[PDB]
């Protein structure tokens, strides 16, 4: 039964900064909000709902030695790093994340739920689904000896090639304890492959994936750079599109008609463009793809916003350093997107993408995930980079 | 910035021998051609664009001990032999080749691109795709002990039996780093099998292969002797047909309607018939097939030329000795094909088969691959057997 | 440079409590101790060197569900539990531990050395070496189906049956990044086996293990309950004996002549005796062994101390709850061992057992591991249950 | 086929588990599981009978001489740089088997103890002598 007094309250449902309020928190939920028991005072601070990041990779972080860790490290080391990664992510103001790839994230989610370690609320997609030679193929770039003694990956490993294998892949993701489904619709930038935007899925396989996920109650997110794969994924019926580098007018029309969410991820594109300039940071197979593709994200996102495509907040951290997600807000504001909409996209739209209702707005009966800022973020977006108070589920983690 | 002065220039776009010209080469391209900086003088020479061979096997060469090398040699020995094979091919005037089978050719292409060894520009198809018991099945003729210790080949090994396996095989060829797709539509002569012209593919599987290859920008070439497999491959939508020993009028009509390219390969047809006369050179399973099939190639190619089928230049070297490709120019001319068309088929039509535009004609903005002949090849076709100057991408390899 | 003012100081090299002192810490070591820079004042506290626990299992903890997690849980879950286990162990005043079995411990040591997580300084033995059916056999109690699909363990798994296999086992332990070697000479209480004190090693295998360990700079610790296995291990030349449940006069004489160290581990015996009374806690195979063997660790340790056998400090935590190690100090003092010797056994004798000269005493040039207690432990042995100040390598962790 | 000098090839180098020439040093658990622990066919030995088979397998693969790593090395993915990694019986077995097939033995060594063991076993040449002392020099001269 705590009473949090807030000097200025942000209404994520309306996007307008309100006056002083008081929140009553009991049993991990918000009991009532009163205009104007222990007391937590934030009279000279701005209170907001906890932020949600819809694209993170908490079990990795990009580094010069990243491409050699596949043959030298074990999952235990990745978990020991993910402890600090999750603590840094939680302390930055993000009380919820959607992890879109990795086999360490379900275990970290279980550990956080059991209270062994501190971190945000994780919605884990598990191992991503791809095709042979795809962006998420685990054996791209391996020589013939290792490839032969490791075999050809199949539905149990996440590699699909037919309609009947997609069903088995979705069922195996459900069996391993996933919360949603992730597919790579086209090629990628950071993979050890040749293509970067070629359509790597047929419409039948994506439709099978969506049908199986709907049978199991899952939602499907699709990584996509090229136009043909993006159009195939949109027409199949996926929920969100992870990148839109080569999005055109017809894809925008189809997205608006279907209701697809768009996750721009400015931060990853800026990071790959910056790191492609350093010699030796990326393999020579990867460097041209990054230097070309990554620089065409801010314009497409601005055009999609101007055309009326629903946009959500996601960072693709794991390329960039964890605990620095809030910088994307700045990248949004300097892209033509108003600060109010940028703050809305991480609170009330992220819950719509996630398909839940118990979070996103500071309303009675919802989860008590509250954060505080020293400065007003509407008149100056940089104030999102200094969080002074973090509370999750009624437990204060930063005062 | 080199100036090559040529006494007589051949116009591959028109097929007519022109007068003296001057080519300006800078940065590996042709800058301008002027009728009438270091100077390379070929005053008493005929200048032509570099030749292209659309059917070679640079990782092997036929010999009496060829059929036992499968169990005694390693890929390293084949690479060490290909080192000399590629140089012998380049010095003969062929600055570009299309390799249609072999798992050593992508590595040799990478080595040549990195500048470690000298050779032509390789477009590699990788491992060929076949069916169970097919012409390109890697385990034909093996006893049951070895066949059990190696298992049954699948899509990862290049053997398909359904549409989904065909899709997986094309995707695996893309993953392994291929530039096009090669399928065996019928039986063959040099296989350790029983049939020589039976249809070994169904229309659905070939259509699946063509669709998957089109999804990745690949072109498909088909090896075919019998009429039924040839017709199936033509109707499915392949680009070129590698043989047509039993081509009839309905196939010729279908080829003309669809636009299929024809590669006769006179040299291999003559070589197999000549070597079938020697006792013990070929296995008793192979000798009748060679002695029968190989002798019916020159008549079919002449009839197809008379009927209006588009014909490209290919030799199927690896059966014949490398560095002797130009002899095919003779076999075409003594088959009724004019010398001008024979020279055109290896320069401007080979680029159309390959699907590129930066080579084939000595024009500004195209690659500077130039060769020179001592005698005029139009009046005498034997002059193609004495090349005196070879330059590839602006670098002179033979003066 | 930090100046620590101490009201009373304990000299581990003499076992006497001195007067006020001042310690100068710079670069993570002790510079000068002056009788009588940022100042840390502990004028009303008793300062001691950091304690060392020579028998812990930081990768596990006893639970009613501990006999089904071998088939349900993953090493990542054990790492996430080990983070908290190590933090609790460090906060209790134990700045160094010797881990005597477990696959997670080397990775936890690496993570702590890199600063990713908090914990003590780990000397990890890695896998424990046993024979077929031994106390440390990883497949004890499994059914025929599981034991078939896993195969018979060999020297790579830690199971040996000859001299040449023991050599390979020691070399494999070195290869995996171990600091010492651990073998089980006899049976154990908690194994899924019939025996509790039978000899399971021959003198020729233990001698080979010791000889191979001496090459790589390793020391050998031996688990033993019965008299014959203890005698074999002592005569072979092991460094320390982990339990002495059935030690007799001849074994004590041999230990005195050889100089072997003895680790009683009162806590494990008391815990197993208390948990054997509960119904269903242990499997029916384990319960009689826990009821019988553990009730004799107190009379044997007292007799060994009265006979002049050298005794060190160890708790076997992971059977007991992590963080409660210091309670063993209460068990030794009530067993007849004086408080000063019990305090020396964890500071100056643990360094002799480990073979490191940089720790153990608060002297210039040594590692700055300093702990503080509210009360005087030489008159009340319960004061070791209230640690008020912890410092490891010059960094303050608890103030 | 190609140009170059006259090669006297030793082939695979023989080492022990975790040795300087171990082909699986530094690999993670997954990779090391799908390759198996190297044996005498891969050049890794741990006894006399395994060393005999290793020398015979080197002969079978077309080698001209035998190469062993007596101690640790600088460039390996291992913790040690000069520790003894061969016992005096294994080196003697290697030399005795090599003498049968007409082979000579070269030894990689940095530390003093491994160098001494290799010199007293009867190797032909020593590849490095980083920590050679007076007794090792006297034994080499003798
Ligand atoms: Zn992506
Ligand atoms: Zn991603
Ligand atoms: Zn063919
Ligand atoms: Zn061919
Ligand atoms: Zn024990
Ligand atoms: Zn133990
Ligand atoms: Zn060396």
Per the structure block, which two tokens stand in for D58?
């080197």
C381 touches chain A (CB under 8 A): no
**How far, CA to CA in Å, does A208 sit from each of A232, B172, B366?**
13, 22, 47
Are the C-beta atoms of C273 and C320 separated by less than 8 Å? no
Per the structure block, which two tokens stand in for C198?
């039978």
Could you list the beta-strand ranges (E) of chain C: 2-11, 16-17, 21-26, 29-35, 38-49, 51-56, 94-99, 121-124, 128-129, 181-184, 220-223, 240-241, 261-262, 370-373, 387-392, 395-398
- Measure CB to CB from residue A107 to each of C77, C108, C111 and give the nearest one: C77
Q: Please, which residues have CB less than 5 A from ligand 5, an ion?
A: C 223, 242
Q: Is B385 helix (H, G, I), strand (E, B) or coil?
A: helix
* Chain A residues with CB-CB distance to C116 below 8 A: 80-81, 83-84
Instruction: Please list the helix, strand and coil fractions of chain C in percent, rounded to the nearest 5, in that order.
Output: 35, 20, 45
* Chain C residues with CB-CB distance to A77 below 8 A: 107, 110-111
**Determination technique used:** cryo-EM
**Chains with 3 or more CB pairs under 8 A to chain D:** A, B, C
Cα-based angle B279, B284, B285 (whole degrees, multiple of 5) = 150
In angstroms, the CA B280 to CA C68 distance is 68
In angstroms, the CA B349 to CA C53 distance is 81
Per the structure block, which two tokens stand in for C116?
């990713």
Q: Which of B25, B18, B19, B27 is nearest to B40 (CA)?
A: B25
In angstroms, the CA B116 to CA B95 distance is 17
Per the structure block, which two tokens stand in for A315?
């960072």
**How far, CA to CA in Å, does A388 sit from each of A362, A385, C84, C147?**
18, 10, 26, 56
Q: Is B218 helix (H, G, I), strand (E, B) or coil?
A: coil
- For an interface test with B, which of A130, A131, A133, A187 has the most B Cβ atoms less than 10 Å from its Cβ? A133
Are the C-beta atoms of B347 and B353 separated by less than 8 Å? no
Are the C-beta atoms of A48 and A387 separated by less than 8 Å? no
Phi-psi region of B265 (alpha: psi -120 to 50; beta: other; left: phi over 0): left
Mutual orientation of helices A75-91 and C75-91 as an angle, nearest 10°? 60
Q: What is the resolution of this structure in A?
A: 2.7
Mutual orientation of helices C105-113 and A75-91 as an angle, nearest 10°? 50
Q: Which of C157, C167, C54, C132 is nearest to C100 (CA)?
A: C54
Q: Is C372 helix (H, G, I), strand (E, B) or coil?
A: strand
Length of chain A: 399
Contact D31 A146 (CB under 8 A): yes
Phi-psi region of A335 (alpha: psi -120 to 50; beta: other; left: phi over 0): alpha
Are the C-beta atoms of B262 and B304 separated by less than 8 Å? yes
Per the structure block, which two tokens stand in for C292?
């019988």
Only one residue has tokens 């477009």, namely: B123
Are the C-beta atoms of B201 and B249 separated by less than 8 Å? no
Q: Are strands C16-17 and C51-56 parallel, antiparallel or unpaired?
A: unpaired
Mapping DSSP onto H, E and C, the string for chain A reads CEEEEEEEEEECCCCEECCCEEEEEECCEEEEEEECCEEEEEEEEEEEECEEEEEECCCCCCCCCHHHCCCCCCHHHHHHHHHHHHHHHHHCCEEEEEECCCCCHHHHHHHHHHCCCCCCEEEECCCCEECCCCCCCCCCCCCHHHHHHHCCCCCCCCECCCHHHHHHHHHHHHHCCCCCEEEECECCCCCCCCCCCCECCCHHHHHHHHHHHHHCCCCEEEECCCHHHHHHHHHHCCCEECCCCCCCHHHHHHHHHHCCEECCCHHHHHHHHHHCCCCCCCCCCCHHHHHHHCCCCHHHHHHHHHHCCCECCCCCECCECCCCCCHHHHHHHCCCCCHHHHHHHCCHHHHHHHCCCCCCCCCCCCECCEEEECCCCCCCHHHHHCEEEEEECCEEEEC
Q: Nearest chain D Cα to A145, which residue?
A: D35
Smallest Cα distance from B99 to chain D, Å = 22
Cα-based angle A101, B173, B114 (whole degrees, multiple of 5) = 95
CA-based radius of gyration for chain A:
21
Contact D83 C154 (CB under 8 A): no
Mutual orientation of helices B249-258 and B227-236 as an angle, nearest 10°? 20
Only one residue has tokens 């197809």, namely: B304
Are the C-beta atoms of A381 and A339 separated by less than 8 Å? yes
B243 touches chain A (CB under 8 A): no
Q: Are strands B16-17 and C94-99 parallel, antiparallel or unpaired?
A: unpaired
Are the C-beta atoms of B104 and B59 separated by less than 8 Å? yes
* C-beta atoms surrounding B358 within 10 Å: 11
Q: Which of B352, B258, B320, B281 is nearest to B88 (CA)?
A: B320
Smallest Cα distance from D67 to chain B, Å = 23
Length of chain B: 399
Smallest Cα distance from C338 to chain D, Å = 42
In angstroms, the CA B168 to CA B174 distance is 10
Per the structure block, which two tokens stand in for C131?
């024979």
> Distance from the CA of C242 to the center of ligand 5, in angstroms?
6
A231 Cβ contact partners less than 8 Å away, ≥ 6 residues apart: A250, A251, A254
Smallest Cα distance from C56 to chain A, Å = 20
* Chain C residues with CB-CB distance to A81 below 8 A: 116
CA C336 and chain centroid, separation: 21
Q: Are strands C240-241 and D13-14 parallel, antiparallel or unpaired?
A: unpaired
Only one residue has tokens 């090299």, namely: C13
In angstroms, the CA A97 to CA A95 distance is 7
> Distance from the CA of D75 to the center of ligand 7, in angstroms?
9
Only one residue has tokens 């892209």, namely: A335
Length of chain C: 399
In angstroms, the CA A106 to CA A78 distance is 13
In angstroms, the CA B188 to CA B176 distance is 25
> Phi and psi at residue B35, in whole multiples of 5°?
-55, 140
**How far, CA to CA in Å, does D107 sit from each of A399, B241, C206, D56, D137?**
65, 59, 30, 18, 15
Are the C-beta atoms of B159 and B134 separated by less than 8 Å? yes
Q: Nearest chain D Cα to B79, which residue?
A: D1
Contact C175 D16 (CB under 8 A): no
Are the C-beta atoms of A77 and A339 separated by less than 8 Å? no
DSSP string, B290-347: HHHHGGGSHHHHHHHHHHT--B-----BTTBPTT-TTHHHHHHHTTT--HHHHHHHTT
Q: Are strands D13-14 and D66-69 parallel, antiparallel or unpaired?
A: parallel
- Residues of B160-188 as b/e, b for ≥16 C-beta within 10 angstroms? beebbbbbbbbbbbbbbebbbbbbbbbbb
Q: Which of D75, D88, D90, D65 is nearest to D15 (CA)?
A: D90
* Chain B residues with CB-CB distance to D2 below 8 A: 80, 83-84
> Phi and psi at residue A144, in whole multiples of 5°?
-70, -30
- Residues of B62-87 as b/e, b for ≥16 C-beta within 10 angstroms? beeeebeeeeeeeeeebbebbbebbb
> Phi and psi at residue B233, in whole multiples of 5°?
-65, -40
Per the structure block, which two tokens stand in for A279?
């010699």
Smallest Cα distance from D1 to chain B, Å = 7
A172 Cβ contact partners less than 8 Å away, ≥ 6 residues apart: A155, A156
Bridge partners, B291 (sequence order): none
Contact A83 C83 (CB under 8 A): yes
Tell me which H or E stretch contains C145: helix C144-150
Per the structure block, which two tokens stand in for A8?
């200025």
CA B26 and chain centroid, separation: 30
Q: Which of B357, B350, B359 is nearest to B262 (CA)?
A: B350
A70 Cβ contact partners less than 8 Å away, ≥ 6 residues apart: none
Q: Is B190 helix (H, G, I), strand (E, B) or coil?
A: coil
- Residues of C41-65 as b/e, b for ≥16 C-beta within 10 angstroms? ebeebbbbbbbbbbbbbbbbbbeee
Could you list the beta-strand ranges (E) of B192-231: 220-223
D120 touches chain C (CB under 8 A): no
Q: Is B221 helix (H, G, I), strand (E, B) or coil?
A: strand
Mutual orientation of helices D134-141 and D112-121 as an angle, nearest 10°? 10
B156 touches chain A (CB under 8 A): yes
> Phi and psi at residue A167, in whole multiples of 5°?
-60, -45
Tell me which H or E stretch contains B389: strand B387-392
For residue A41, with 0-12 CB atoms within 10 Å meaning exposed, 13-18 middle and 19 or more buried, which class applies?
Answer: exposed
Cα-based angle D27, D31, D33 (whole degrees, multiple of 5) = 110
Q: Is C110 helix (H, G, I), strand (E, B) or coil?
A: helix
Tell me which H or E stretch contains C234: helix C227-236
Question: Is C touching B (3+ C-beta pairs, cut-off 8 A)?
Answer: no
- Residues of C251-274 as b/e, b for ≥16 C-beta within 10 angstroms? bbeebeeeebbbbbbbbbbbbbbe
Are the C-beta atoms of A97 and A89 separated by less than 8 Å? yes
In angstroms, the CA A42 to CA A46 distance is 8
């Amino acid at each position: 039964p705590v009473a949090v007094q807030c000097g200025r309250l942000f209404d994520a449902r309306s996007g307008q900064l309100k006056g002083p309020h008081t929140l009553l928190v009991a049993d991990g939920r918000i009991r009532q909000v009163l205009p104007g028991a222990r007391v937590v005072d934030l009279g000279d601070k701005v209170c907001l709902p906890g932020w949600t990041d819809l694209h993170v990779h908490l079990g990795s972080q990009s580094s010069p030695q990243s491409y050699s860790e596949d043959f030298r490290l074990d999952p235990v080391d990745h978990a020991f790093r993910a402890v600090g990664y999750a603590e840094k992510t939680l302390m930055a103001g993000f009380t919820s994340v959607r992890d879109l790839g990795g086999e360490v994230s379900p275990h970290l989610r279980d550990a956080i739920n059991q209270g062994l370690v501190r971190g945000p609320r994780i919605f884990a997609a598990g191992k991503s689904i791809a095709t042979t030679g795809g962006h998420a193929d685990p054996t791209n770039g391996w020589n013939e000896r290792l490839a032969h003694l490791v075999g050809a990956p199949g539905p149990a490993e996440g590699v699909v090639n037919s309609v009947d294998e997609a069903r088995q892949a979705v069922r195996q993701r459900y069996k391993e304890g996933s919360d949603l489904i992730k597919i790579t619709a086209t090629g990628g930038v950071l993979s050890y492959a040749r293509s970067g935007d070629a359509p790597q899925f047929t419409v039948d396989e994506i439709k099978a994936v969506v049908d199986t996920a709907r049978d199991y109650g899952f939602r499907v997110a699709a990584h996509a750079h090229g136009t043909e794969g993006m159009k195939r994924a949109v027409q199949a019926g996926v929920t969100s599109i992870e990148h839109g580098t080569y999005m055109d007018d017809e894809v925008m029309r189809l997205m608006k008609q279907h209701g697809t969410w768009y996750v721009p991820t400015f931060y990853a594109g800026r990071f790959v463009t910056e790191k492609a300039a350093i010699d030796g940071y990326f393999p020579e197979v990867v460097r041209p793809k990054a230097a070309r593709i990554g620089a065409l994200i801010s314009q497409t996102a601005a055009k999609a916003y101007r055309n009326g495509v629903r946009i959500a907040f996601g960072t693709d951290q794991g390329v960039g350093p964890h605990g620095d997600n809030a910088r994307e807000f700045v990248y949004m504001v300097e892209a033509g997107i108003p600060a109010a909409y940028a703050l809305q996209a991480a609170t009330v739209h992220a819950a719509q993408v996630l398909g839940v209702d118990d979070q996103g707005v500071l309303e009675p009966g919802k989860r008590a995930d509250v954060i505080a800022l020293a400065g007003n973020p509407l008149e100056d977006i940089n104030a999102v980079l200094d969080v002074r108070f973090v509370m999750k589920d009624g437990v204060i983690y930063k005062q």
